[PDB]
Amino acid sequence: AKEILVAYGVDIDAVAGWLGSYGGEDSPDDISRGLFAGEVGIPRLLKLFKKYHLPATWFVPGHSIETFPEQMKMIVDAGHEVGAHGYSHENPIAMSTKQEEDVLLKSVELIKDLTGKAPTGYVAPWWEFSNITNELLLKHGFKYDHSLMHNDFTPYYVRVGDSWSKIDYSLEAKDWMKPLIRGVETNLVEIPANWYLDDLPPMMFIKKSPNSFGFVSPRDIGQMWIDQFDWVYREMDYAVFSMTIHPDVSARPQVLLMHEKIIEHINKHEGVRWVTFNEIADDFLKRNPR
Amino acid sequence: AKEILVAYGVDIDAVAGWLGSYGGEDSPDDISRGLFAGEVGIPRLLKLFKKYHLPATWFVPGHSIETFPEQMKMIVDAGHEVGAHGYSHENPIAMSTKQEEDVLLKSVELIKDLTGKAPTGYVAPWWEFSNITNELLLKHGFKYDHSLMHNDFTPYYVRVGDSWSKIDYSLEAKDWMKPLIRGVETNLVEIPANWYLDDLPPMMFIKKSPNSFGFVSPRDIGQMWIDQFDWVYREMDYAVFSMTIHPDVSARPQVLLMHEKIIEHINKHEGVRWVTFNEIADDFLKRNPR
Amino acid sequence: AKEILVAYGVDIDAVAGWLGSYGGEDSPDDISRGLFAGEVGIPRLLKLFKKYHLPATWFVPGHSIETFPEQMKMIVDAGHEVGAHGYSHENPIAMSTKQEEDVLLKSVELIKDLTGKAPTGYVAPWWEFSNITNELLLKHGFKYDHSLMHNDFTPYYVRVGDSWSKIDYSLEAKDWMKPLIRGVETNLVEIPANWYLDDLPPMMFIKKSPNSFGFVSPRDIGQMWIDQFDWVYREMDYAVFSMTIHPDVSARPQVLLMHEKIIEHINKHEGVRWVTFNEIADDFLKRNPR
Amino acid sequence: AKEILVAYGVDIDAVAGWLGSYGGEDSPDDISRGLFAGEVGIPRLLKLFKKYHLPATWFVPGHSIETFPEQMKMIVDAGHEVGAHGYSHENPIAMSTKQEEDVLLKSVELIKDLTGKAPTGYVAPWWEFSNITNELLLKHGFKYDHSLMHNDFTPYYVRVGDSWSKIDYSLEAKDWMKPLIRGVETNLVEIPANWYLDDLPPMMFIKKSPNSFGFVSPRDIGQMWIDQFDWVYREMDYAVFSMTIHPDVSARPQVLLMHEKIIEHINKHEGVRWVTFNEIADDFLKRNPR
Ligand SMILES: [Zn+2]
Ligand SMILES: [Zn+2]
Ligand SMILES: [Zn+2]
Ligand SMILES: [Zn+2]
């Protein structure tokens, strides 16, 4: 028996992505791409999904919620899930605890006002943590996170309190020669992030980044994503296969075609189930409690 | 039912590009590559266009006009359109108001003395704005710009006055948790620039930039460009599909071949119309006014 | 006659590589990747190796030995070799001679404890030497190293005492215009490292490095690795063909697929012997003494 | 009819390149790649050329001469041409006038003692000039340089005295809004360098460079080189098609294979003539004097 849970996760980075993460704060041109992502990118992603009758989870920065209100209505009315993703896409590790907690509070408030329900899902901007577990569980709603990478194609419960010894070369070796020390499992389910199922780093060009790419072939990317799916399909009976995309990138014509090949390849397989992240979190919590 | 407007926008970066944008000001070797683009590159692209009976718009830095006067004659005499592109490829955002204005004055004077008419088209060097909209409309002529990215395959009127709140981590979150505020549309038409339709960053090698590439395959890029065309053709009845190239890069034999594949593919389609950017601007001004 | 010795060398970088080399010491997201590599990665490479009945050598950081004890047990039970690889993946050049010596002792202590025998093989973290060659022979055990690049498909005896003159542009040219002066062979066998046979740089994404890649296609790399083998099989009668992998990278489904191709292709060839690094070293020491 | 002059230019960077250009001066591991290039790389490229009965020019750093004397004898006895390439691959633009002149005097001295005749050919390390034109013509011998890029597939006489105005944003625009002023042709013939016909930047990995690559596919590079040859052959009656390689890179098995494909493709075409750079230079001097 094959139970393959498959989801698209859309991080609406848009203008917020350029303020917090990708260095576009003083660039009109970069800001204009942020606006493309919302005004042009969200609806093309909705048409793509509507075409294959797919559900999806949208992780939306508070900035994008208030900057693209008309497209936000289009997202809710399609019956899709809205999750959290900062306000202006700020990297949590760079914020104070109060700044991070305030950002999360505003996000919940903005999503609740938009959907009627509190968000249950989170993606940390640029995928970085801090004391986020404690904050997510504390700020109610939050059932699951899609930011961490302890695993691949299986959800798990996130541990709080892991520690490790950093190398300090001004000391002697015995001071840092100690093994990572595992913390304690919490109720936050992880639906793992994955750089190999992330449209943005290979296919978006960023001048302000030393590790920007942007000109990797979408056919090579699609093919790689598809090889990942085939392997998962061949090796695992239950699995979650989630793809992280951004209207910024995946609503560009060349990678829209890529997604059509991916979806159409996945749909050739029996035992596939297109779902939202909340449904994965619900199913996993029911699959193995504790 | 198909009206696909298709154009080459040739930015004659040549030497100007290396003085203003690409860090070659102290490199005899980079400077000589600049001379290749003017002396060798302009005639090879002209031969390319003549072969397929294509029109084109050349956006020429004042530096290139005065450094390659004989190649300039070849561009005019072929009946192609000439637009502005700085003098020494200066990034507008680093310039003063007067410097940027002076640059713009000189560009206009030079193109007028060369062609007989004032330019109607502008490309910002390295695609960066500042307060350019206002200057383009003030310095007469300028009908259209090809620097911005609010859209990809549909022109639009450029808004002046968009504002946004930068993240300041020395303050509290509420100080930057505000949306982008849209300004007001001017009569400046935008014929969108697109990093995904720009020969230079993937296929020009630059020692002085850490986000240089240069060795992305021209067959992949061409295939990507054609995929962009095919999606546009399948989804839209009216569209403008403009390609930004440089003699620097697109006059290298391996990408001259690439363009031949592209042009021959585009030419298989009904409803294609090869045009200048000015013709797109005029056609757009007539299509939807205000 | 053909004797083609083929081997997999697994550097279990994991959490250690992020601590020592890849900038992830202040990143919960990167540490999470580290733990993937050890908890999921290690058993998937074992399933692969066992699928083709292959031996392997695992060059294991002390930090990984102690952080992943259940996976260590699994490595020894399968009968694979365990070589040394620092503790927290520290660069031998950044360390005091005492730190370095203390790192090598603790490694040796940990591996003996685990296996019953002292290690005979070493890989230097991030592939650098310093005064290692003396320390490796001195710390008894060590027969062979797999860090250096004087050759590629033939082992050789590591020379000690090589020196060269650096360019100081403050002085005159005659002060630095001198050749490299070769030292003297030692008994340390080199089983050469090779950037062209290393899964990590092309295919792990790292933001903390400007020299990072991550999105080079695994199909392109697999092809390039087979091409290397294809030339070798055709041009040499005796050869060693070792591939450096990491559970970090080679336990990702798309790279596992890559390896399956590489392995099956290599098994079409007769004269091929799948061995451990210790067996290559032993072979070499028999092949040509002194 | 068809006279396509085709040559390999082998720059023996080896250890010199790591001292002078690629940041390996403090790296035992990089130095070993340097030694690989000389000890293993030169003979493999000699076996390659001999197989197809090809002549070649080796542009050899004095550092490589004195460090690989036995391989230097192999290059001479194979009857190939020897040109200059710095001592420790030093960038001319970084050197004093005296250092650069001293470096050049020593190179001439070493090459003469090695071959019997003074060198006629020069490649600037890392391809940069300064006041080299004057020194190459002053330091007798030197007939041709292969460092500059004013053209790609036609030789030319190098101009001395080119000048241009740099951008200084502390002044007004009119201060720098002036064209490049061409100087005057000298007798130095250029057989152009070309980043698109250079094996090293796409396929050698350099940790010290932010602009390093190293993992671009050799099949893509080979295909790109064959596309260049195919266009030149289709478009030109007389042309020089010279390829720059390094034992460092092109003596790697995956790239030897690439070259075999390249050479075999070129040999199918009529009018091809494999020559040394010296023969190209002489042919050019005879083709058009002045
Ligand atoms: Zn995001
Ligand atoms: Zn430009
Ligand atoms: Zn390692
Ligand atoms: Zn060189």
Side-chain angles (χ1 to χ4, degrees):
Chain A
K2 211 138 277 182
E3 207 178 353
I4 307 302
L5 285 58
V6 185
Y8 274 106
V10 185
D11 301 351
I12 311 191
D13 285 20
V15 176
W18 295 106
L19 302 177
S21 293
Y22 309 130
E25 92 190 334
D26 288 326
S27 174
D29 208 75
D30 290 341
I31 294 299
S32 78
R33 275 198 285 170
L35 287 170
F36 164 87
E39 303 178 341
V40 179
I42 296 164
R44 306 220 278 222
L45 282 186
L46 281 171
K47 271 168 274 148
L48 172 71
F49 293 151
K50 182 186 179 75
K51 184 178 185 184
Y52 299 94
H53 311 282
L54 303 183
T57 299
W58 303 68
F59 299 100
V60 196
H63 188 284
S64 304
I65 288 160
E66 299 192 286
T67 294
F68 311 99
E70 285 314 300
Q71 291 78 24
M72 292 299 95
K73 254 55 180 175
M74 295 171 57
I75 293 180
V76 176
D77 289 357
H80 290 307
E81 186 204 346
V82 174
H85 201 29
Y87 187 94
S88 297
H89 208 268
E90 46 290 292
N91 312 351
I93 204 151
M95 283 188 291
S96 270
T97 83
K98 184 196 176 185
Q99 280 166 337
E100 182 178 332
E101 194 163 16
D102 285 347
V103 157
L104 191 59
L105 269 156
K106 183 76 161 173
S107 321
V108 166
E109 171 172 309
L110 281 175
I111 292 166
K112 199 167 180 170
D113 293 355
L114 168 71
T115 59
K117 48 167 293 291
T120 61
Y122 181 80
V123 169
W126 218 187
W127 283 346
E128 294 270 53
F129 252 46
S130 74
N131 69 332
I132 330 265
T133 316
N134 157 93
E135 259 154 313
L136 292 177
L137 297 170
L138 198 135
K139 289 310 157 193
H140 200 197
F142 288 103
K143 188 180 312 185
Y144 71 87
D145 167 86
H146 175 52
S147 311
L148 296 168
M149 317 200 172
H150 297 95
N151 210 315
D152 256 24
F153 302 104
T154 315
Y156 57 94
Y157 292 96
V158 178
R159 284 194 310 269
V160 73
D162 281 3
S163 71
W164 52 93
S165 320
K166 303 176 197 65
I167 300 159
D168 186 326
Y169 283 128
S170 63
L171 311 172
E172 299 305 316
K174 64 171 172 295
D175 275 280
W176 30 272
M177 293 197 290
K178 297 171 204 173
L180 193 135
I181 301 160
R182 289 177 178 82
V184 171
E185 195 157 313
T186 70
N187 287 327
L188 184 73
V189 39
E190 178 69 25
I191 302 167
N194 195 338
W195 292 116
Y196 300 112
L197 293 164
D198 183 8
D199 70 341
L200 193 146
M203 298 178 292
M204 166 174 299
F205 173 69
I206 302 163
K207 299 159 92 202
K208 295 282 289 171
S209 176
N211 273 325
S212 149
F213 298 97
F215 297 98
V216 175
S217 147
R219 288 168 178 256
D220 280 324
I221 289 301
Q223 177 65 67
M224 193 202 301
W225 289 25
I226 285 164
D227 294 346
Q228 294 181 75
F229 179 85
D230 291 346
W231 182 94
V232 164
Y233 193 78
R234 183 239 268 162
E235 295 290 322
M236 299 167 76
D237 290 318
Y238 161 73
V240 311
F241 186 94
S242 75
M243 295 168 270
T244 293
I245 57 180
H246 305 73
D248 308 65
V249 178
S250 281
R252 308 286 172 172
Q254 73 275 7
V255 18
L256 278 169
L257 293 181
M258 177 191 92
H259 285 299
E260 292 184 352
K261 294 313 180 306
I262 291 173
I263 300 162
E264 281 168 12
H265 176 86
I266 288 170
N267 277 347
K268 283 185 169 72
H269 299 73
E270 296 270 329
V272 163
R273 197 162 89 83
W274 288 94
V275 290
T276 65
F277 279 65
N278 194 65
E279 290 184 319
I280 294 170
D282 282 347
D283 177 74
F284 179 74
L285 285 161
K286 196 166 60 180
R287 189 162 309 247
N288 53 307
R290 192 61 86 201
Chain B
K2 211 136 277 182
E3 205 176 351
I4 307 303
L5 287 59
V6 182
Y8 278 107
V10 183
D11 301 349
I12 311 186
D13 281 15
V15 179
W18 296 105
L19 299 177
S21 290
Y22 311 136
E25 88 187 330
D26 292 326
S27 177
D29 210 73
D30 295 344
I31 295 300
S32 80
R33 276 199 281 167
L35 289 173
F36 162 85
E39 298 172 336
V40 180
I42 290 164
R44 303 220 278 219
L45 285 182
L46 279 173
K47 275 171 276 147
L48 172 69
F49 294 144
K50 183 186 180 76
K51 180 182 182 185
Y52 295 94
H53 311 281
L54 304 185
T57 300
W58 303 68
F59 300 99
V60 197
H63 189 284
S64 304
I65 287 160
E66 298 191 289
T67 300
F68 311 103
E70 271 316 313
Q71 288 76 21
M72 292 299 95
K73 254 55 180 175
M74 297 171 59
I75 299 178
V76 180
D77 291 357
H80 288 160
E81 186 207 342
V82 181
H85 202 31
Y87 189 94
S88 297
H89 213 269
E90 312 78 5
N91 310 345
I93 199 151
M95 285 190 291
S96 271
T97 290
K98 184 196 176 185
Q99 281 165 337
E100 186 182 338
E101 195 161 16
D102 286 346
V103 156
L104 190 58
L105 265 314
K106 184 75 162 175
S107 319
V108 168
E109 166 174 306
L110 285 173
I111 295 164
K112 199 169 179 171
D113 289 354
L114 167 70
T115 64
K117 46 168 290 288
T120 52
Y122 177 83
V123 175
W126 209 208
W127 284 346
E128 293 265 52
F129 252 47
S130 75
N131 74 331
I132 332 299
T133 316
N134 160 271
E135 259 153 314
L136 291 180
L137 299 174
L138 195 135
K139 286 308 157 191
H140 198 199
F142 288 107
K143 189 182 314 186
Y144 71 87
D145 164 81
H146 171 48
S147 313
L148 296 168
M149 317 200 175
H150 299 89
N151 209 311
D152 50 6
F153 303 99
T154 311
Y156 57 91
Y157 295 98
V158 180
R159 283 195 312 271
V160 73
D162 281 4
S163 64
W164 52 93
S165 321
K166 301 174 194 63
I167 296 159
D168 192 335
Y169 285 134
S170 64
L171 311 170
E172 294 302 316
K174 65 171 174 297
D175 275 282
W176 31 267
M177 292 199 289
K178 294 169 202 172
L180 175 155
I181 307 157
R182 290 174 179 81
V184 168
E185 262 180 29
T186 71
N187 283 323
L188 183 74
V189 37
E190 177 65 25
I191 298 167
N194 195 333
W195 291 117
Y196 297 113
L197 294 166
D198 180 7
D199 70 342
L200 192 145
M203 290 182 287
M204 167 172 298
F205 172 69
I206 302 164
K207 299 162 94 201
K208 298 283 288 172
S209 178
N211 268 323
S212 144
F213 298 101
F215 298 99
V216 178
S217 150
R219 286 172 180 255
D220 291 336
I221 288 302
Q223 175 68 70
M224 189 204 297
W225 288 24
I226 282 163
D227 296 350
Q228 293 182 74
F229 181 83
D230 290 347
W231 183 96
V232 165
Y233 192 82
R234 184 240 269 161
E235 296 293 321
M236 299 168 77
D237 290 320
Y238 159 72
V240 312
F241 186 94
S242 77
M243 297 169 272
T244 299
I245 63 181
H246 305 75
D248 311 60
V249 171
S250 280
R252 306 286 174 172
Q254 73 276 7
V255 20
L256 277 171
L257 293 181
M258 175 193 89
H259 284 299
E260 288 182 350
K261 296 314 183 308
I262 288 172
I263 299 163
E264 279 167 13
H265 180 89
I266 292 171
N267 281 351
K268 279 184 166 69
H269 299 74
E270 297 268 331
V272 159
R273 194 162 86 79
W274 287 91
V275 289
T276 68
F277 278 67
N278 195 66
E279 286 181 312
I280 298 170
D282 284 347
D283 174 284
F284 180 73
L285 282 162
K286 192 163 58 182
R287 188 163 310 247
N288 50 307
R290 196 60 85 201
Chain C
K2 198 135 300 183
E3 248 184 292
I4 303 304
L5 290 65
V6 188
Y8 272 113
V10 182
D11 306 344
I12 313 183
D13 281 14
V15 170
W18 290 108
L19 287 191
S21 298
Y22 308 128
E25 100 187 329
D26 284 337
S27 171
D29 207 67
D30 293 330
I31 301 302
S32 89
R33 273 196 281 174
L35 291 170
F36 161 85
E39 296 177 336
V40 182
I42 288 167
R44 306 219 277 219
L45 281 175
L46 276 174
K47 257 163 277 146
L48 172 71
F49 292 156
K50 174 175 194 55
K51 176 185 189 159
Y52 294 96
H53 310 286
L54 302 185
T57 302
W58 300 69
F59 296 98
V60 190
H63 170 108
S64 292
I65 295 156
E66 290 194 285
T67 293
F68 306 107
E70 279 323 288
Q71 292 78 17
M72 290 324 103
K73 259 37 177 173
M74 286 178 61
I75 286 166
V76 178
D77 279 11
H80 292 298
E81 188 204 337
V82 174
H85 197 36
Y87 187 98
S88 299
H89 215 266
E90 46 288 303
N91 189 337
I93 197 154
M95 282 188 296
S96 298
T97 71
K98 188 198 171 186
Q99 291 164 328
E100 184 175 2
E101 191 150 24
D102 290 348
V103 168
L104 201 56
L105 283 149
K106 181 81 171 163
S107 305
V108 166
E109 151 165 10
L110 288 176
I111 289 165
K112 192 161 185 153
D113 275 31
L114 176 63
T115 52
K117 40 173 297 292
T120 51
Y122 180 81
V123 174
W126 216 200
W127 284 350
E128 283 289 12
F129 261 31
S130 83
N131 73 327
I132 339 282
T133 183
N134 154 289
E135 261 169 279
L136 291 171
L137 302 156
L138 200 127
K139 283 330 145 167
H140 191 243
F142 291 106
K143 191 175 320 180
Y144 72 90
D145 167 270
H146 172 48
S147 316
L148 301 156
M149 312 203 178
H150 302 90
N151 204 326
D152 53 10
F153 300 106
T154 320
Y156 58 89
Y157 291 101
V158 182
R159 273 197 317 269
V160 72
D162 283 11
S163 81
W164 52 95
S165 314
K166 304 170 177 65
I167 302 150
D168 191 338
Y169 288 120
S170 64
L171 313 173
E172 298 299 348
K174 60 150 180 308
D175 277 297
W176 31 270
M177 290 195 289
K178 293 164 190 178
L180 173 154
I181 306 159
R182 288 176 184 81
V184 158
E185 242 174 60
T186 65
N187 280 313
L188 184 73
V189 185
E190 177 64 31
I191 300 161
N194 203 329
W195 297 118
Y196 298 120
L197 290 167
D198 180 4
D199 65 350
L200 191 144
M203 294 193 278
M204 173 170 299
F205 175 67
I206 310 163
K207 310 142 95 204
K208 297 292 294 174
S209 180
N211 313 55
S212 159
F213 303 96
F215 302 106
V216 178
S217 162
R219 279 169 185 272
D220 290 329
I221 291 300
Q223 179 63 79
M224 192 204 292
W225 288 22
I226 277 162
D227 288 347
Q228 274 182 100
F229 179 82
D230 281 5
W231 185 92
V232 166
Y233 194 78
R234 177 248 272 176
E235 291 288 309
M236 302 168 74
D237 292 310
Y238 159 72
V240 308
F241 188 90
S242 59
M243 308 161 262
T244 298
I245 69 182
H246 306 69
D248 312 49
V249 171
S250 279
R252 311 286 185 173
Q254 74 276 3
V255 187
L256 276 171
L257 287 181
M258 183 192 85
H259 284 303
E260 297 195 337
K261 304 301 174 313
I262 291 175
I263 293 171
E264 284 164 9
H265 176 86
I266 294 176
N267 280 350
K268 284 187 159 61
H269 298 73
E270 209 239 312
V272 163
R273 198 150 71 88
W274 283 92
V275 283
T276 58
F277 275 69
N278 193 49
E279 290 184 322
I280 294 169
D282 282 347
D283 192 77
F284 189 72
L285 286 165
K286 223 160 61 176
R287 184 138 326 221
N288 48 273
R290 198 70 68 179
Chain D
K2 267 294 169 53
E3 211 175 354
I4 306 302
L5 282 56
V6 179
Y8 276 111
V10 184
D11 302 349
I12 312 191
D13 282 14
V15 176
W18 297 104
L19 302 177
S21 287
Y22 312 130
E25 91 190 331
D26 292 325
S27 179
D29 215 78
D30 288 339
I31 297 299
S32 79
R33 275 199 281 170
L35 289 172
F36 165 92
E39 298 180 339
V40 184
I42 295 164
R44 301 220 276 218
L45 283 183
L46 279 170
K47 273 169 275 147
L48 171 68
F49 294 145
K50 181 188 180 76
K51 180 181 183 184
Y52 295 95
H53 313 279
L54 305 185
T57 299
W58 304 69
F59 298 99
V60 199
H63 190 287
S64 303
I65 288 160
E66 300 195 86
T67 294
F68 310 97
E70 281 316 305
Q71 293 75 25
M72 288 300 96
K73 255 55 179 176
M74 295 172 59
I75 294 180
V76 176
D77 291 357
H80 291 162
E81 186 206 349
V82 179
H85 199 28
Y87 188 89
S88 297
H89 206 268
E90 46 286 286
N91 309 345
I93 199 151
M95 284 188 290
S96 266
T97 288
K98 184 196 177 184
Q99 282 166 340
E100 184 184 338
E101 192 157 13
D102 286 347
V103 159
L104 190 60
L105 269 158
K106 181 74 161 172
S107 322
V108 166
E109 166 173 307
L110 284 177
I111 295 166
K112 197 168 179 170
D113 284 351
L114 165 70
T115 56
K117 50 166 293 291
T120 62
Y122 179 82
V123 174
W126 223 192
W127 282 345
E128 294 268 55
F129 256 47
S130 74
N131 75 332
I132 333 299
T133 321
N134 155 268
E135 262 154 316
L136 292 180
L137 297 170
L138 196 135
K139 217 50 60 171
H140 323 268
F142 287 107
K143 189 183 313 187
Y144 70 87
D145 162 83
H146 174 50
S147 310
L148 298 170
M149 316 202 173
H150 300 91
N151 208 313
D152 46 4
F153 301 102
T154 317
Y156 57 94
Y157 295 96
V158 177
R159 283 196 309 271
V160 72
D162 281 6
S163 67
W164 53 92
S165 321
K166 300 174 193 64
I167 297 160
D168 188 331
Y169 287 128
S170 64
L171 311 169
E172 294 300 314
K174 64 169 172 296
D175 274 284
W176 31 272
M177 291 199 290
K178 296 170 204 172
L180 174 153
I181 302 157
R182 290 174 182 80
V184 168
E185 261 180 27
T186 69
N187 281 281
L188 184 73
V189 38
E190 178 69 25
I191 299 168
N194 198 339
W195 292 119
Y196 297 115
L197 293 163
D198 182 7
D199 67 340
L200 193 144
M203 293 184 288
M204 170 174 301
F205 173 72
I206 306 162
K207 299 162 92 204
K208 296 283 289 172
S209 177
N211 280 74
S212 149
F213 301 98
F215 300 103
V216 173
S217 146
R219 288 168 181 256
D220 292 336
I221 287 298
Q223 181 65 66
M224 189 205 297
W225 288 24
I226 284 163
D227 295 344
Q228 290 183 73
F229 180 89
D230 290 345
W231 182 93
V232 168
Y233 193 79
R234 184 239 269 163
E235 294 289 319
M236 298 169 79
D237 290 318
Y238 161 72
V240 310
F241 186 92
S242 78
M243 297 170 272
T244 297
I245 60 180
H246 305 72
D248 312 68
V249 171
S250 282
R252 307 286 173 173
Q254 73 273 2
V255 198
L256 279 168
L257 294 183
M258 175 195 89
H259 283 301
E260 293 185 353
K261 299 315 180 306
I262 291 172
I263 296 163
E264 280 170 14
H265 175 85
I266 293 170
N267 279 349
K268 282 185 167 71
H269 300 73
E270 294 268 331
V272 160
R273 194 165 88 81
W274 287 89
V275 289
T276 57
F277 275 66
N278 195 67
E279 290 179 317
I280 293 170
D282 279 344
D283 173 86
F284 180 72
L285 281 162
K286 197 168 61 180
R287 190 160 308 246
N288 57 310
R290 195 62 86 203

